[PDB]
Design a protein around this ligand. Structure first.
Ligand SMILES: CCCCCCCCCCCCCCCC
Ligand SMILES: *[C@@H]1O[C@H](CO)[C@@H](O)[C@H](O)[C@H]1NC(C)=O
Ligand SMILES: *[C@@H]1O[C@H](CO)[C@@H](O)[C@H](O)[C@H]1NC(C)=O
Ligand SMILES: *[C@@H]1O[C@H](CO)[C@@H](O)[C@H](O)[C@H]1NC(C)=O
Ligand SMILES: *[C@@H]1O[C@H](CO)[C@@H](O)[C@H](O)[C@H]1NC(C)=O
Ligand SMILES: *[C@@H]1O[C@H](CO)[C@@H](O)[C@H](O)[C@H]1NC(C)=O
Ligand SMILES: *[C@@H]1O[C@H](CO)[C@@H](O)[C@H](O)[C@H]1NC(C)=O
Ligand SMILES: *[C@@H]1O[C@H](CO)[C@@H](O)[C@H](O)[C@H]1NC(C)=O
Ligand SMILES: *[C@@H]1O[C@H](CO)[C@@H](O)[C@H](O)[C@H]1NC(C)=O
Lengths: 796, 58, 92
């Protein structure tokens, strides 16, 4: 009675006009969005290809000057002969841009003016005219970048570089991906007696500095040998080098100790055996054996004869530390097998060496001329210029000098660099418009590795691993770890990785947006591949979200009175109104402050997207008609502390206009936990306010009560609003006592007859009387699910 | 200064030292192609640097 | 890696009753769901151990040395450029 749940259903039903309940086809909706995303990742493929050919056709004619005392190369070094640029503050990138040249970032210890670098600043000065052509062809093209394999990156929209600059392009994920194909590394650390001391500190450092050059689609293991070959970790086969699997290997390498004689035969006979293990789902090429050692005598020729006779495995060898052992046998092993030999004398020589083997793995890529220039999108990572969550498309550029003279007996099998073009996720979340869906529905997409690009539970912060300690990885959330696992969402995931297109309706648990409640619900997972890439755009809809209210309104009078309806001065007699900040052409989003935005909104509709602004007005009037007709009449009902309504479209109203100051739920309706929670049930829901928060409440705010607003407008079910009240506890305390704990799912105390329990309202019932709950759980009431939230912060 | 640059022309600019050998905690220091304290370029510098040896100091 | 937990009703049964055996004593509870509402009403014999927690508490992830035994499904790429004959192996 107080809220007016059936006092609004009539209002929505009364205005049969001003509606058109249209259906979400859920198959023409995925395909029309999975074809827009494919178009986006294809425009960034033209910008790439057009960039590779221009940096390959200019390299060919450079002439290799060696005298820059005159004809000085001119460029804008990012950390500030040089260019003094003019910077325009562009809100798109969030920093200062110039648009008139390309910045250059020489790493912090590559000499800015050496000969090998001053040439690189010359023949890459012909890219500036195709960097400018690309965006001038299509704006909203964020970062072109040429990652030259001499340290340099020439990223186009020249911003000041973002405390020591350890950035080095040759290690960024978008480079090690373009520059080489998936690997099967196998590090053979040599933990024997002779590496005791400093040589071990460099081996443990350098190993953990090589596991950082491994993507998520290439496997790794870390053996070791001291007259018996074992594993440092507990794995016993190749383990994919995820964000997590690496941490097991890095933390097991760091806890290694030198002891015992050195035996190269028994330690290579263990490496070659773990590369033949073909029932582990390995990445089935670029087998490698990266031996770390100091120096020995035995070149185990009979091992490289039994195994690796036909030269399939590449033995890279590192002779790390300062010593005087024979580096002769080691050099033979890397030369006989198709490898290379690196020397790591001390720290500082670790970073520049462990990234070099990609120049070797990339040899069979250059020779495969244009079957190897294929765009390739990195898994989501955090941009290194404070842009947000981005994905980059990589495309190598080869060195065509002397080509068509058929000289090609040279350094013509190395790559100049990998060049990339960043796509931000906040640009993919704009090709999947969420507002013709219920708050529960959403799109998502996954890699062929399972990691979700574009998921609503993908927070823009680095993924976590392990409990922290007292004292460049990408954001890779697997699809089964962003949502509650069940034996049906495994089938969905396994059928999206294979690229199949289908549909599947089932009843599933859905975690509440505030990680406190779980809701059983019906969900229909539609998915379809994004042709021309390797992704699977899916779309999940509640079974009642198959229709949405698209408003038709052209009278300019009915919306006129709607316009002043939500003016801030009319708030006493029409509730304290909020609007969800949403995407309009030029209207400015909040500064975390809603009331500024509500003021902003009025001018832009006063002056003259179409649907979003058309729908918000219809809700404002439809809500206002309630808050004027019924909510105003029966003012100040006894048990009520506040009466609120929320709609899809933004309008959120509270009558007292004093309780509005105590309205904690954020103005975005599509993120309100209760609005999603109550939309899913077919009854009332009680959301216990948290216990012992930083902010006040739970006495002057009461406890929320909510109910959906179901409508059968033309025989079609809709739930387009949620009305509810904030019940004061004190009024409800007496009616309880006039009749012991009252309780809701999730075990949150609402009231107790005893008034020490009711003092700590909202606490988890089970931090109160745990002996009851553990027994109460075990009577097949109060189930519990235990998921992991890989993106969260801890103090130690 | 950078133990990995073995000539004049390659030893210019900055490089990354690590204090106490800790792998973290970098320090940016310049590269200096410096001769030894007591060198043998001249006969006179050779005599001075042989004197300090015959003193048993350094 | 915080480890969240959430609770909800298993059975749609409304009437609950039983006996506690916490220690050197016993208790009787009765519990009834407020029908057509997300609520549960229980009383137990007036008061006479270890805490349960619902807030997310820090924990190491799932045993990584065990999920690799039976890993998730995965499809790697297929370009796979390696092992070309016309390559100069004169570098070392
Ligand atoms: C007397 C024999 C050894 C003394 C050192 C020779 C003089 C050193 C001159 C150095 C001037 C650069
Ligand atoms: C994908 O390609 C097929 C042709 O094989 C096409 O008919 C279909 O519309 C495409 N689907 C999407 C989502 O692009
Ligand atoms: C893609 O490029 C074409 C080229 O003209 C342009 O018309 C289109 O708007 C672009 N679309 C996107 C999503 O960038
Ligand atoms: C290379 O430098 C020379 C003189 O420094 C100049 O002739 C030439 O334009 C430069 N190359 C490019 C691509 O600008
Ligand atoms: C380190 O390795 C030793 C080897 O016996 C083992 O006893 C110890 O538990 C390990 N510690 C850690 C933290 O891995
Ligand atoms: C995998 O291969 C290993 C080594 O040959 C063998 O011991 C093991 O039984 C195999 N496992 C499976 C699942 O085939
Ligand atoms: C490419 O190879 C040629 C010799 O064919 C060499 O002169 C040129 O410097 C190489 N490319 C780069 C970027 O150094
Ligand atoms: C409330 O939280 C603070 C946080 O520091 C804590 O110190 C205090 O003991 C808590 N009080 C109750 C009653 O939970
Ligand atoms: C959640 O708990 C229920 C009831 O115990 C169980 O049936 C289900 O498998 C659990 N689901 C998850 C994702 O743990």
């Amino acid at each position: 009675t107080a809220s007016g749940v059936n006092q609004l259903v009539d209002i929505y039903e009364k205005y049969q006009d001003l509606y058109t309940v249209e259906p979400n086809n859920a198959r023409q909706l995925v395909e029309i969005a999975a074809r827009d995303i494919e178009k986006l990742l294809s425009n960034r493929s033209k910008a790439l290809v057009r960039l590779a050919l221009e940096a390959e056709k200019v390299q060919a004619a450079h002439q290799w000057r060696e005298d820059f005392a005159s004809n000085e190369v001119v460029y804008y070094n990012a950390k500030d002969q040089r260019i003094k640029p003019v910077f325009i503050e562009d809100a798109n990138f969030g920093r200062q841009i110039s648009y008139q040249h390309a910045a250059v970032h020489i790493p912090t210890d590559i000499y800015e003016g050496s000969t090998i670098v001053l040439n690189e600043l010359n023949w890459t000065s012909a890219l500036d005219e195709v960097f400018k052509k690309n965006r001038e062809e299509d704006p909203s093209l964020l970062w072109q970048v040429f990652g030259s394999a001499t340290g340099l990156a020439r990223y186009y929209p020249a911003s000041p570089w973002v405390k020591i600059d350890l950035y080095d392009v040759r290690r960024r994920p978008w480079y090690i991906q373009g520059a080489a194909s998936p690997k099967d590394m196998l590090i053979l650390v040599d933990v024997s007696g002779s590496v005791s001391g400093l040589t071990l500190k460099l081996i443990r450092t350098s190993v953990s500095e090589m596991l950082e050059t491994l993507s998520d689609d290439d496997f790794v293991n870390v053996a070791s040998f001291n007259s018996n070959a074992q594993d440092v970790s507990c794995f016993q086969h190749l383990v994919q080098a995820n964000v997590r699997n690496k941490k097991v290997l890095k933390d097991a390498v760091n806890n290694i100790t030198a002891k015992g004689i050195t035996d190269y035969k028994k330690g290579f006979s263990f490496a070659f055996e773990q590369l033949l293990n073909y029932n582990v789902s390995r990445a089935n090429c670029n087998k490698i054996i990266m031996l770390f050692t100091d120096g020995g005598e035995e070149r185990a020729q009979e091992i490289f004869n039994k195994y690796n006779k036909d030269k399939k495995v590449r033995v890279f060898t590192f002779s790390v530390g300062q010593h005087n052992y024979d580096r002769g046998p080691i050099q033979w092993m890397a030369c006989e097998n198709k490898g290379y030999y690196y020397e790591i004398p001390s720290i500082g020589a670790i970073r520049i060496n462990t990234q070099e083997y990609l120049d070797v793995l990339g040899r069979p890529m250059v020779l495969a001329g244009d079957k190897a220039k294929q765009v390739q999108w990195t898994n989501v990572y955090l941009d290194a210029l404070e842009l947000g969550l981005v994905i980059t498309g990589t495309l190598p550029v080869f060195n065509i000098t002397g080509q068509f003279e058929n000289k090609t007996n040279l350094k013509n099998q190395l790559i100049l660099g990998v060049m990339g073009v960043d796509v931000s996720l906040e640009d993919i979340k704009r090709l999947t418009p969420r507002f013709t869906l219920c708050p529960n529905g959403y799109y998502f997409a996954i890699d062929p590795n399972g990691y979700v690009l574009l998921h609503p539970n993908l927070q823009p912060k680095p993924i976590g691993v392990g409990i922290p300690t007292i004292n460049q990885e990408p954001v890779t959330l697997d699809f089964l770890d962003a949502e509650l696992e069940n034996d049906i969402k495994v089938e969905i995931r396994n059928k999206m990785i294979d690229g199949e297109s289908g549909e599947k309706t089932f009843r599933t648990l859905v975690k509440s947006q505030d990680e406190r409640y779980i809701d059983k619900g019906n969900r229909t997972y539609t998915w379809t591949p994004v042709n021309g890439t390797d992704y699977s755009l899916a779309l999940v809809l509640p079974t009642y979200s198959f229709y949405y209210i698209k408003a038709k309104l052209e009278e300019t009078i009915t919306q006129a009175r709607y316009s002043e309806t939500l003016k801030p001065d009319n708030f006493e007699e029409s509730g304290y109104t909020f609007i969800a900040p949403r995407d309009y052409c030029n209207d400015l989003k909040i500064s975390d402050n809603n009331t500024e935005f509500l003021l902003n909104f009025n001018e832009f509709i006063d002056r003259k997207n179409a649907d979003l602004i058309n729908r918000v007005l219809l809700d404002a009037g439809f809500t206002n008609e309630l808050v004027q007709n019924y909510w105003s009449k029966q003012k100040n009902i006894k048990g009520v502390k506040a009466r609120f309504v929320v709609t899809d479209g933004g309008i959120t109203r509270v009558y007292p206009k004093e309780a509005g100051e105590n309205w904690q739920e954020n103005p975005e309706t599509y993120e309100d936990s209760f609005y999603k929670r109550s939309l899913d049930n077919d009854n009332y829901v009680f959301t216990a306010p948290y216990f012992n928060k930083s902010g006040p409440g739970a006495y002057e705010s009461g406890i929320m009560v909510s109910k959906a607003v179901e409508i059968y407008i033309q025989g079609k079910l809709l739930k387009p609003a949620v009305v509810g009240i904030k019940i004061d506890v004190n009024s409800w305390i007496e009616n309880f006592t006039k009749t012991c704990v009252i309780l809701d799912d999730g075990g949150f105390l609402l009231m107790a007859n005893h008034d020490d329990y009711t003092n700590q309202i909202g606490r988890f019932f089970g931090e109160i009387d745990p002996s009851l709950m553990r027994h109460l759980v075990n009577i097949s009431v109060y189930a519990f699910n235990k998921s992991y939230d890989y993106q969260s912060v801890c103090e130690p | 200064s950078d133990s990995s640059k073995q000539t004049e022309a390659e030893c210019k600019g900055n490089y990354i030292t690590y204090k106490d050998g800790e792998v973290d905690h970098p320090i940016i220091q310049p590269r200096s192609w410096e001769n030894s304290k007591f060198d043998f370029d001249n006969v006179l510098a050779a005599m001075m640097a042989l004197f300090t040896v015959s003193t048993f100091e350094g | 890696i915080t480890e969240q937990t959430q609770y909800f009703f298993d059975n749609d049964s409304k009437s609950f009753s039983g006996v506690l055996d916490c220690g050197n004593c016993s208790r009787i509870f009765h519990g009834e769901k407020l029908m057509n509402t997300n609520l549960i009403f229980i009383m137990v014999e007036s008061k006479g151990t270890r805490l349960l927690i619902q807030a997310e508490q820090t924990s190491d992830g799932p045993n990584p040395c065990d999920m690799v035994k039976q890993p998730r499904y995965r499809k790697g790429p297929d370009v796979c450029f390696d092992n070309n004959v016309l390559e100069d192996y004169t570098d070392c």
